[PDB]
Amino acid sequence: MEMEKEFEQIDKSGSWAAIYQDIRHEASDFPSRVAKLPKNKNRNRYRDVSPFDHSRIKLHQEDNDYINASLIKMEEAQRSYILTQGPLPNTVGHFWEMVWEQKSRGVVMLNRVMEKGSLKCAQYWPQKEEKEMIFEDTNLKLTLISEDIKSYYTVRQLELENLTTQETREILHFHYTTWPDFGVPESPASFLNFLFKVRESGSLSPEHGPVVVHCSAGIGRSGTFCLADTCLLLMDKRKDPSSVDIKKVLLEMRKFRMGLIQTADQLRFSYLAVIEGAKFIMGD
Ligand SMILES: Cc1ccc2c(c1)[C@@H]1[C@H](CO2)CN2C(=O)CCN12
């Protein structure tokens, strides 16, 4: 069923809450035993948001290999994503260790450091060229190279140095700065523009490790980003773009991380983004 017609049928009937609860009921439940070990309590931002054991990213160290991060592997679309929480004061070094070890080119940030008057993640990148950051626990150095501030997003060029080997890599930081403190954006136009800027950079391409995507918990806004990207890629590959079922793609992604899409309003916004996405790239 063409999703644009499914959309108007749900809107006219006002059944968004009913559709959303059906997804919550059918979603996978897999063990997260490593996340719940007592040694890992200060590595989790939220007690109710944990990576599954089968899909968690492992840090390359013998001490403690745990980080709140999941590998989302989309077999038909041929895309992979790492979805993670906003870094905590004691996990900023783990975060950059993961970017290094997984060979990621891009980090996608969908939150502000402060929202609703409370801290939603650590200040984990340098704000001035001449004041670099050193992470002594993981032996990494991070330097701000350049910053491009636009109305709806900022892009940063960062240099990550493995102090152990003196190898360096260029990381691109894509910061979506205008998601509202409450609800979802009225139009998906600026979110879509942002998504196609991340693509144009190479950060989502198979010649690099998976993109790292985060918000505060790494399930709601983060879920919206990967769901829109994968659905638009499937519409480009298939003989019948009308066969793409957004609810079935979301349930496949929920095999790899719990809770993706946190509200019925985020589910409706994801439909709106894909639908408009299709028109721009398939109509005109
Ligand atoms: C669906 C959509 C919306 C916006 C948008 C794109 C796609 C992106 C980039 C422009 O922003 C450039 N681009 C094209 O010219 C073809 C499509 N793709």
From Swiss-Prot:
Per the record, the similarity remark reads:
Belongs to the protein-tyrosine phosphatase family. Non-receptor class 1 subfamily.
In the record, which positions carry S-nitrosocysteine?
215
Residue list for modification Cysteine persulfide: 215
Q: Which GO terms describe its biological process?
A: actin cytoskeleton organization; cellular response to angiotensin; cellular response to fibroblast growth factor stimulus; cellular response to hypoxia; cellular response to nerve growth factor stimulus; cellular response to nitric oxide; cellular response to platelet-derived growth factor stimulus; cellular response to unfolded protein
The organism encoding this protein is Homo sapiens
Active-site positions on this chain? 215 (phosphocysteine intermediate)
Name this polypeptide is given:
Tyrosine-protein phosphatase non-receptor type 1
Tell me the residues on which Cysteine sulfinic acid (-SO2H) occurs: 215
